[PDB]
Structure formats: structure tokens, C-alpha cells
Design an enzyme around this catalytic site. Structure first.
Site, PDB file in Angstrom:
ATOM      1  N   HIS A 140       0.813  -1.247   0.020  1.00  0.00           N
ATOM      2  CA  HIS A 140      -0.029  -0.144  -0.055  1.00  0.00           C
ATOM      3  C   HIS A 140       0.882   1.283   0.032  1.00  0.00           C
ATOM      4  O   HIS A 140       0.674   2.128  -0.915  1.00  0.00           O
ATOM      5  CB  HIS A 140      -0.980   0.039   1.288  1.00  0.00           C
ATOM      6  CG  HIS A 140      -1.695   1.211   1.397  1.00  0.00           C
ATOM      7  ND1 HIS A 140      -3.323   1.064   1.389  1.00  0.00           N
ATOM      8  CD2 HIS A 140      -1.836   2.491   1.568  1.00  0.00           C
ATOM      9  CE1 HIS A 140      -3.679   2.255   1.547  1.00  0.00           C
ATOM     10  NE2 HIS A 140      -2.771   3.159   1.608  1.00  0.00           N
ATOM     11  N   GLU A 141       2.045   1.254   1.064  1.00  0.00           N
ATOM     12  CA  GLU A 141       2.762   2.461   0.779  1.00  0.00           C
ATOM     13  C   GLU A 141       3.618   2.410  -0.036  1.00  0.00           C
ATOM     14  O   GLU A 141       3.934   3.611  -0.607  1.00  0.00           O
ATOM     15  CB  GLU A 141       3.668   2.474   2.283  1.00  0.00           C
ATOM     16  CG  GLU A 141       2.843   2.482   3.538  1.00  0.00           C
ATOM     17  CD  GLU A 141       1.749   3.530   3.538  1.00  0.00           C
ATOM     18  OE1 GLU A 141       0.871   3.357   4.297  1.00  0.00           O
ATOM     19  OE2 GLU A 141       1.913   4.568   2.794  1.00  0.00           O
ATOM     20  N   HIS A 144       1.741   4.391  -2.920  1.00  0.00           N
ATOM     21  CA  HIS A 144       1.795   6.045  -2.918  1.00  0.00           C
ATOM     22  C   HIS A 144       3.240   6.395  -3.164  1.00  0.00           C
ATOM     23  O   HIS A 144       2.969   7.468  -4.228  1.00  0.00           O
ATOM     24  CB  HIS A 144       1.616   6.530  -1.508  1.00  0.00           C
ATOM     25  CG  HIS A 144       0.268   6.526  -0.739  1.00  0.00           C
ATOM     26  ND1 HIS A 144      -0.937   6.740  -1.207  1.00  0.00           N
ATOM     27  CD2 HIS A 144      -0.100   6.063   0.430  1.00  0.00           C
ATOM     28  CE1 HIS A 144      -1.888   6.549  -0.443  1.00  0.00           C
ATOM     29  NE2 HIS A 144      -1.130   5.988   0.455  1.00  0.00           N
ATOM     30  N   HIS A 150      -5.972   6.815  -2.342  1.00  0.00           N
ATOM     31  CA  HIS A 150      -6.898   5.908  -1.686  1.00  0.00           C
ATOM     32  C   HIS A 150      -7.814   5.738  -2.668  1.00  0.00           C
ATOM     33  O   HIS A 150      -8.328   6.030  -3.776  1.00  0.00           O
ATOM     34  CB  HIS A 150      -7.338   6.572  -0.523  1.00  0.00           C
ATOM     35  CG  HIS A 150      -6.276   6.372   0.571  1.00  0.00           C
ATOM     36  ND1 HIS A 150      -6.290   7.607   1.569  1.00  0.00           N
ATOM     37  CD2 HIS A 150      -5.324   5.604   0.774  1.00  0.00           C
ATOM     38  CE1 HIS A 150      -4.956   7.061   2.186  1.00  0.00           C
ATOM     39  NE2 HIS A 150      -4.506   6.101   1.791  1.00  0.00           N
TER      40      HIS A 150
HETATM   41 ZN   LIG Z   1      -2.478   5.284   2.503  1.00  0.00          ZN
END
Ligand SMILES: [Zn+2]
Length: 198
Positions: A140-141, A144, A150
Site C-alpha cells: 500500500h505504502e 503511494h 486511496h
Molecule cells: Zn495510505
């Protein structure tokens, strides 16, 4: 998605070193399983993650790890630019900490920071005994760093895709259509040259 390659450095702080009872082996099994999970989740995007380095801070932490995740992330970013990139080069570095971050945050990373000497950095907390769960937060990180936002589940139509703001009880190992378009836009608009070659 054309093929891309990330040389990833993972650094484990002292707090996590003591948690696993000063056992590097135990830390290493966790970290390699994680890299396996990440690659598994990035396969549909055609991104190959290679663990270019695992540094375990066994003597002491080389930056002060603070509960304020954004202050720790920024300190780590400078330490990477300033110290880490001088010894061994890498495209991205994430700090794995056992430290309880403020406001139930278990991970933080710089949006569109991929390839940047200061920004290609991330932070994730070893909050679960389950490697898969910690691997979903790291994916997830990493999402980014690669320009992903999101999921507005309402219009992205996914409840537990990798980019949901809150990690689910049973995360799926999938990216939403939304995340794919964001990544596609990241490549198109920014095209980090460091991830072009293996
Ligand atoms: Zn996030």
C-alpha cells in the site's frame, strides 16, 4: 503496464531488533516472505521488486524514531539521501519499525516519491504477527511512492483493495481499477527513470 523494476532497501530499526529477541534470522525470514508477498501483489502491474539490501539497526537506531510518523519519515528520508545512498544505491527505502505511531497509523509514505533521493522513502509498522498483513501495508505504502491515491470505494467499487485507507480484516491482494489508472498516470506523467532497468 510495461515492465518496471524496483531495487528496494528495507531497514529495520533497533526497537524491532529487540522485539524479535535480537534474532536476525527471525527478522530475515519475515522480511523475505514480505518481499515474496509484495512481488505477488505487484505482478498484475508488471513491477518486479528486488530486495537490494536489508540493514538491521542492532547496535542502535541511526535516527530518532518518534511516534509522530511524519517526523520519523522525514528524518529517514534525509538519512537515506545523506548516508544510505552514499554506500549502496537503491530506488526506494522503507523503514520497518516496532514503534507505535500516533493516531493508529501503521504506515506512511511520500506520494509520487519514487526514484527521488529524498522522497523515495516509506514507513511501516510491524503491527501484526502475520507477515501477510504487514506485507499488505508495505504494498500500500509502495503504492503511494508510485502515485496511487486511496480508493473512493463508492466510485472505485472495491471494499478491500490494496489502496483502501483502512486495512481490512481480510485484505484482498488486489489493486482497484482506480489504482491502476493512477499508476498509469504516474508512469505517463512522471516516468521515473530509475525503475526502467533491472
Ligand atoms: Zn495510505
Amino acid at each position: 503496464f510495461p515492465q518496471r523494476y524496483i531495487e528496494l532497501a528495507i531497514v529495520v530499526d533497533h526497537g524491532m531488533y529487540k522485539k524479535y529477541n535480537q534474532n536476525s534470522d527471525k527478522i530475515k525470514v519475515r522480511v523475505h516472505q514480505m518481499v515474496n508477498h509484495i512481488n505477488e501483489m505487484y505482478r498484475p502491474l508488471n513491477i518486479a521488486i528486488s530486495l537490494n539490501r536489508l540493514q538491521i539497526w542492532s547496535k542502535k537506531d541511526l535516527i530518532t524514531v518518534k511516534s509522530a510518523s511524519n517526523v520519523t519519515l522525514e528524518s529517514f528520508g534525509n538519512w537515506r539521501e545523506t548516508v544510505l545512498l552514499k554506500q549502496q544505491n537503491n530506488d526506494c527505502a522503507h523503514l520497518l519499525t516496532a514503534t507505535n505511531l500516533n493516531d493508529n497509523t501503521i504506515g506512511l509514505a511520500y506520494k509520487k516519491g519514487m526514484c527521488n533521493p529524498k522522497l523515495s522513502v516509506g514507513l511501516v509498522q510491524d503491527y501484526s504477527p502475520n507477515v501477510f498483513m504487514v506485507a499488505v501495508t508495505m504494498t500500500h505504502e509502495l503504492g503511494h511512492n508510485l502515485g496511487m491515491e486511496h480508493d473512493d470505494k463508492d466510485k472505485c467499487k472495491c471494499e478491500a483493495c490494496i489502496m483502501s485507507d483502512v486495512i481490512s480484516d481480510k485484505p484482498s491482494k488486489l489493486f482497484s481499477d482506480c489504482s491502476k489508472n493512477d499508476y498509469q498516470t504516474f508512469l505517463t506523467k512522471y516516468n521515473p527513470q530509475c525503475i526502467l532497468n533491472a
